[PDB]
Amino acid sequence: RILKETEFKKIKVLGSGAFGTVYKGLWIPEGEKVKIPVAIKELREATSPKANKEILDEAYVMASVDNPGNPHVCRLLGICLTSTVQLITQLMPFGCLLDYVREHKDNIGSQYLLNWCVQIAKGMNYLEDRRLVHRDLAARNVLVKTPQHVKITDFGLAKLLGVPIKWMALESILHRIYTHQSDVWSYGVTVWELMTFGSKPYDGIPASEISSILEKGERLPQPPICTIDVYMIMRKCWMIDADSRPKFRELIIEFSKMARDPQRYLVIQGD
Numbered sequence: 283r284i285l286k287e288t289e290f291k292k293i294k295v296l297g298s299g300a301f302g303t304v305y306k307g308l309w310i311p312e313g314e315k316v317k318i319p320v321a322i323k324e325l326r327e328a329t330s331p332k333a334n335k336e337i338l339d340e341a342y343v344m345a346s347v348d349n350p351g352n353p354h355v356c357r358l359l360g361i362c363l364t365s366t367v368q369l370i371t372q373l374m375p376f377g378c379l380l381d382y383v384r385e386h387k388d389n390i391g392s393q394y395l396l397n398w399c400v401q402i403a404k405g406m407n408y409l410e411d412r413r414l415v416h417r418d419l420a421a422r423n424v425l426v427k428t429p430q431h432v433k434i435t436d437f438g439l440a441k442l443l444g445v446p447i448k449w450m451a452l453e454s455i456l457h458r459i460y461t462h463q464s465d466v467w468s469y470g471v472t473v474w475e476l477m478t479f480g481s482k483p484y485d486g487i488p489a490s491e492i493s494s495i496l497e498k499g500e501r502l503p504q505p506p507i508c509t510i511d512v513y514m515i516m517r518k519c520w521m522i523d524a525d526s527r528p529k530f531r532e533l534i535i536e537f538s539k540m541a542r543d544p545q546r547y548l549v550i551q552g553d
């Protein structure tokens with residue numbers, strides 16, 4: 283869908299960063315009498331070295347991922363090209379999962395945390411089936427539609443417009459190699475962020491020192507709520523050998539087994 287600036291309106295500002303700005307807005311599709319609540323992401327201008335017609339063609343090839351789609355992967359509703367690129371998707375009212383876990387710390391039970399792990403692995407498995415590599419999986423790029431339904435966003439957005447060292451696999455930090463097995467490493471880091479209720483990975487350690495710390499065998503610590511069964515899964519996502527890391531289909535099954543008896547795998551004061 284190519285959107286005209288008159289089809290949508292930016293009401294409030296939801297987020298802001300170097301990437302650009304996210305707006306909570308409204309969209310009235312052309313020839314329809316309905317107003318759909320959406321989120322508009324206005325990316326930073328002159329970021330990409332590509333023409334508008336080149337970006338548009340590549341985003342149309344990439345949006346083929348909305349077909350047949352997955353419930354745990356965001357659908358790109360529309361794109362609007364002016365001086366900036368504007369991405370329009372359905373509004374996710376609870377924000378990102380990074381903020382959600384930090385704000386509801388003492389109210390999240392083991393059942394929720396394990397279900398989120400399952401849902402993220404389901405969305406990632408789908409992206410792997412469509413052969414699209416995310417490149418930026420993190421708890422900040424997981425959106426909360428409802429506390430029981432989460433979705434992955436910003437997949438392939440970096441590739442579309444030709445740097446999170448603390449979420450990158452060793453081969454991505456050293457050789458800029460981005461496969462589905464490096465997305466597994468990022469997934470392990472993401473799971474650690476949910477398990478620690480939004481802690482920042484390797485806090486204080488400069489990004490410049492991450493690759494040397496990884497080669498010494500140092501990994502993210504074992505979160506207080508994780509039994510060794512859950513920590514071993516994350517620890518396997520951070521292996522040096524990419525092909526030995528688990529697959530998204532194995533992670534869905536492992537975390538589904540854990541979500542069937544959650545108090546056995548996660549120890550939370552409140553369950």
Ligand SMILES: *CCC(=O)N1CC(n2cc(-c3ccncc3)c(-c3cccc(NC(=O)c4cn(C5CC5)cn4)c3)n2)C1
Nearest residue numbers: 297304321322323344358369371373374378422435436437
């Ligand atoms: C919580 C951390 C934070 O501040 N972040 C900003 C970023 N974020 C949030 C949203 C969003 C908020 C509310 N409701 C929905 C989304 C977005 C966002 C907005 C619009 C569009 C997107 N992404 C895409 O449209 C898109 C397209 N692709 C592929 C075709 C290339 C991938 N993603 C995201 N961003 C989290």
